[PDB]
Amino acid sequence: FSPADFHXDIACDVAR
Amino acid sequence: FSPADFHXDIACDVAR
Amino acid sequence: GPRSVASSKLWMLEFSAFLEQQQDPDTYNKHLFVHIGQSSPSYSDPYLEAVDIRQIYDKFPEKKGGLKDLFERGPSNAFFLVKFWADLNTNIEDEGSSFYGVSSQYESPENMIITCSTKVCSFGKQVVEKVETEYARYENGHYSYRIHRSPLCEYMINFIHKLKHLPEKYMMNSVLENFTILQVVTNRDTQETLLCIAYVFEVSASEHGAQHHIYRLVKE
Amino acid sequence: GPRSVASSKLWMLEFSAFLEQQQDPDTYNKHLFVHIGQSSPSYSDPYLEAVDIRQIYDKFPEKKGGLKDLFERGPSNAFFLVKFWADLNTNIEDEGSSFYGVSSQYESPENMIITCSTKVCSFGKQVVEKVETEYARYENGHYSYRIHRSPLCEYMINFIHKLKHLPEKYMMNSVLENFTILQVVTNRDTQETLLCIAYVFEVSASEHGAQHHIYRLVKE
Numbered sequence: 053f054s055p056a057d058f059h060x061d062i063a064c065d066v067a068r
Numbered sequence: 069f070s071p072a073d074f075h076x077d078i079a080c081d082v083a084r
Numbered sequence: 085g086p087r088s089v090a091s092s093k094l095w096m097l098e099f100s101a102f103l104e105q106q107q108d109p110d111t112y113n114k115h116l117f118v119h120i121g122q123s124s125p126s127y128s129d130p131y132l133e134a135v136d137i138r139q140i141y142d143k144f145p146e147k148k149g150g151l152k153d154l155f156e157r158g159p160s161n162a163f164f165l166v167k168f169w170a171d172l173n174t175n176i177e178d179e180g181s182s183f184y185g186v187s188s189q190y191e192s193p194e195n196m197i198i199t200c201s202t203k204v205c206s207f208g209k210q211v212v213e214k215v216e217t218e219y220a221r222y223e224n225g226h227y228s229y230r231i232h233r234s235p236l237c238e239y240m241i242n243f244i245h246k247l248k249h250l251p252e253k254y255m256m257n258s259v260l261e262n263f264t265i266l267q268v269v270t271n272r273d274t275q276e277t278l279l280c281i282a283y284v285f286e287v288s289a290s291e292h293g294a295q296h297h298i299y300r301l302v303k304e
Numbered sequence: 305g306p307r308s309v310a311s312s313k314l315w316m317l318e319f320s321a322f323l324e325q326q327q328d329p330d331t332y333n334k335h336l337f338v339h340i341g342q343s344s345p346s347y348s349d350p351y352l353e354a355v356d357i358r359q360i361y362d363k364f365p366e367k368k369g370g371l372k373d374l375f376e377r378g379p380s381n382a383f384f385l386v387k388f389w390a391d392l393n394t395n396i397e398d399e400g401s402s403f404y405g406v407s408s409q410y411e412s413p414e415n416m417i418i419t420c421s422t423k424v425c426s427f428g429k430q431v432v433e434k435v436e437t438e439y440a441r442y443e444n445g446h447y448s449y450r451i452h453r454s455p456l457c458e459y460m461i462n463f464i465h466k467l468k469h470l471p472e473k474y475m476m477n478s479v480l481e482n483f484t485i486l487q488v489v490t491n492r493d494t495q496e497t498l499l500c501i502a503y504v505f506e507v508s509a510s511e512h513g514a515q516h517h518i519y520r521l522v523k524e
């Protein structure tokens with residue numbers, strides 16, 4: 053389980 | 069069925 | 085067509101009588117008995133535009149400050165009749181803690197101190213009276229007012245409870261044709277009647293639930 | 305003991321994030337994920353009164369307008385940390401129409417125009433920002449403010465959905481320790497920080513449900 057991957061499938065395109 | 073009796077068991081003491 | 089419960093100075097956007105049951109501190113179930121709002125837009129009755137005030141004199145408060153007295157003083161455009169088809173189909177009383185309340189919302193072009201007086205009538209006689217004073221909140225150029233979760237008294241709760249537990253719809257309707265509410269919203273400083281609404285009731289038998297129509301109040 | 309999320313000028317009486325499901329036009333079910341109010345009075349943690357701001361710098365917005373920058377400008381008495389134990393135990397998404405929102409309520413001795421800026425942070429970086437402007441309503445000598453049913457965006461809804469469907473509490477907690485919210489309430493005309501709340505999260509495992517503690521924010 054990766055907490056970083058979990059938040060990345062939500063905010064990867066929003067990270068600016 | 070009496071509509072008057074129905075409203076009387078609610079408001080009989082309130083009627084002033 | 086669409087109708088707004090609105091005079092030149094005040095518009096009632098929302099009105100709802102409800103029962104809320106707390107199942108646990110984070111879980112709530114809410115049932116609406118009657119409702120006017122964005123979820124229940126107001127429409128006129130295609131078979132009857134207006135109700136003559138003489139046809140309802142005997143169902144509302146008489147003498148000074150009564151419906152007839154208020155209508156004569158006017159303005160005429162502040163007087164409305166709402167017919168509700170109440171939804172009594174709920175069992176939310178059974179478990180958990182319950183709350184019966186009524187919420188309403190208003191809009192005005194002006195910043196006023198308003199007084200809302202609500203009179204419950206049984207057989208034309210006043211039995212309950214609740215008076216609330218509200219202040220404005222500026223929003224998007226106009227002023228908003230809200231009566232948030234005003235509690236129903238024990239007589240209104242008892243009435244609902246016994247009404248819900250009647251074995252027949254005809255018994256519910258013969259009881260409801262003798263129950264009326266007269267809501268008067270006033271400018272506290274000028275005494276002007278901003279809105280006056282006479283409410284009449286019937287039980288709803290629609291799969292869609294609670295329904296309503298707005299009628300103009302006239303004296304012809 | 306009891307704690308109020310309040311500075312010299314503004315008090316947050318209520319805060320709640322919720323999911324409301326409309327079963328039918330007259331039936332609504334509401335689940336609270338997090339809540340602060342009369343139903344959930346605020347208490348301090350007997351094991352920790354205050355949190356040093358240096359222990360959380362990396363979890364919140366950095367640079368101008370960030371947490372550290374804001375705290376330094378003060379007033380110190382407007383800065384708080386809330387730890388929530390969120391209740392994710394609901395299946396109200398499954399049927400009917402859903403609404404995710406957040407509601408909050410405030411009180412002030414003064415009549416101000418307030419600005420509420422809410423920043424959602426993932427791994428210390430700002431991902432969502434919602435800004436709301438509110439006006440006062442005079443009530444019982446003070447001024448009341450309300451952010452009523454502010455909608456959650458699709459990223460917050462998606463986050464909740466995936467979080468709820470994790471097979472383990474440890475996975476929910478390792479996700480939640482990287483999720484923070486920074487709420488800043490400002491006087492729009494004077495720019496004074498009226499309240500600044502840093503929120504941290506964990507999953508609740510209590511039969512009582514959602515829980516919270518209020519911590520003072522300090523720099524020692």
Ligand SMILES: *C(=O)CCCCCCCCCCCCC
Pocket residue numbers: 101117118170186202204212213214234235236237240244265285
């Ligand atoms: C204080 O008494 C509150 C105001 C009294 C009633 C307000 C409106 C109640 C609406 C009736 C609910 C439906 C009953 C069939």
Ligand SMILES: *C(=O)CCCCCCCCCCCCC
Pocket residue numbers: 321337338390406422424432433434454455456457460464485505
């Ligand atoms: C606009 O984006 C609205 C504000 C963003 C979130 C406000 C607070 C959300 C509370 C979190 C719910 C519980 C999640 C575990």
